[model samples]
Target: DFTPPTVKILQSSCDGGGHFPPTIQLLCLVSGYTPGTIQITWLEDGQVMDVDLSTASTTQEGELASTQSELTLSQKHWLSDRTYTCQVTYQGHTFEDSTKKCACRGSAYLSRPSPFDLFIRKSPTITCLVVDLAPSKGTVQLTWSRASGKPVNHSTRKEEKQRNGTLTVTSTLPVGTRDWIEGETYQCRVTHPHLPRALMRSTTKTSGPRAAPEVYAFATPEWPGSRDKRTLACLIQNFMPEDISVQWLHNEVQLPDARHSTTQPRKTKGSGFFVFSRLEVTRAEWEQKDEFICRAVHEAASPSQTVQRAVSVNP
Candidate 1:
């Protein structure tokens, strides 16, 4: 019996917006085909793109072969109204996929409050938003005010453009936890050309930040044959406000090649959240008795208030 070809296509754009001054690059991966001979075509708005297509040599995966192809074009040519397509034909089957560009859009949200002392003493709380647009030419405005229609003062503001043509904007507003009266409202307004109306986010007066995280560190032996590698878990548990930052450090410095994972802060039965983080280290590194430190910090600490658990490889 002969095996029929099965096609799988995966696509991605250099910039999610699909437009940039340097150029917009699109990639397509075609895989899982039995036949060795395959044809690929690139199209724009239903017409041949008429540009050189870069395709990689196919590799054998048992009974199947896989290949990748890429297409590039100027931002001016990749308009929002046009459609991009990759057509693949092999053996007796043909498959087609397409993508369309999108316009600038964004949304805003309020962050959890800072500790009451910070706000009550004229410190600030943060409100943030992310905007997406092609060409990266546009403006976003944010405003903070109280429920009494009185304007509020922000301590700081931040805006950053991402490689994918998305902009992240944040504003820090000075608030006094003690000054916050019940039933009083705080509002954040966001404005941009892409939005039909100014977007506003509101929160009731509240008091807040970082409490020390409980650090628990331990190691687990790998299965019988895998003695060379060991899995280490550093649980930073019972953190408040769910904004605790955690990292694994080797020899007092940060671990560049450490493989680790952290969980989202899960709400406790009472208040605040808890998180668990795990790291993997080689048995050789563990045997060195090197100081492997698990550090956790929160915003409430003014001068880098940090909590850590140090486990020596020998122990």
Candidate 2:
């Protein structure tokens, strides 16, 4: 009897950074199946993509074989609110996987002003703007300019390609501390071949902060050998102003024993940022029926908010 193929899918952007007109590549890896013959197909928004846009190849590995299929597309099609799917047929069995286009995000930051004397010689502080595309591809050029259309002495640019086929472009403009006045309208312009018009994202205009995060508390499975223990996690999402804190509590007090870990707050594909805090509790604690709390704090909130879940051996 032939074993079923183990399949995995990965996507990436050819360009290092996301600007516009992204070129996205979807790769599907199928391995550990019997018989080398396999059929592969790709679809965009439910419709079949051109055959030339995809390629497939198979390799032999001892008693088993592996196949790789890849599909390529432009960011324009990716942003069309369409779905993409890859289908594989082998040995009278069929398997399929799909993904959707990602959201577009832009951010800008200003360097904090220094307390040095006004006229003293100091290297200008650089203001940076970053545009990110998730599952997006394309070449992008970034420009930094003052509100008054003047050129600065120092400027920097960089491009990076993400494993998921997204691109991020960063542009920095240097300005003297004296020029770091309020209400200054520095601009970061992004140009891409896929976009008919250049995109502009700015900073320092101070908008009202967003609402506090929505927190979810739950327990996840531990390792198979350590099933006697419980791993609780707090998911914090959709908060604004970037900086947020997360902590774990036991019976209404901070967890005294140091069995907790939290990840840094990170920006999401959409608006706002999110973070995860995890607590590793022993099986004894779970059977004790102790209450586990996830405490989240953000500047956008007047005080921290918490969600509690009771521990149970079966939970």
**Candidate number achieving the greatest TM-score relative to the actual structure:** 1
Q: After superposition, how far is residue 119 of candidate 1 from its true place, in Å?
A: 15
Candidate 1 lands at a TM-score of 0.43
lDDT of 2: 0.66
Residue-level lDDT tens digits of model 1 in 199-286: 7787763356445567888877557987787777877766665666677888556775347887878987866677787888886776
lDDT (C-alpha) at residue 109 in model 2: 40
User: How many residue pairs clash per model?
Assistant: 2, 11
**Native-to-model Cα distance after best TM-score fit, residue 98 in candidate 2, in Å:** 0.5
Q: Mark the regions of model 2 whose C-alpha exceeds 4 Å error after superposition.
A: 13-21, 103-315
How does each model score on TM-score? 0.43, 0.34
Residue 310 of model 1: what lDDT?
A: 80
- After superposition, the stretches of candidate 1 with alpha carbons farther than 4 Å from their true spots are 1-106, 110-127, 131-139, 142-188, 201-211, 256-259, 299-304
Candidate 1: the clashing residue pairs are 115-208, 116-208
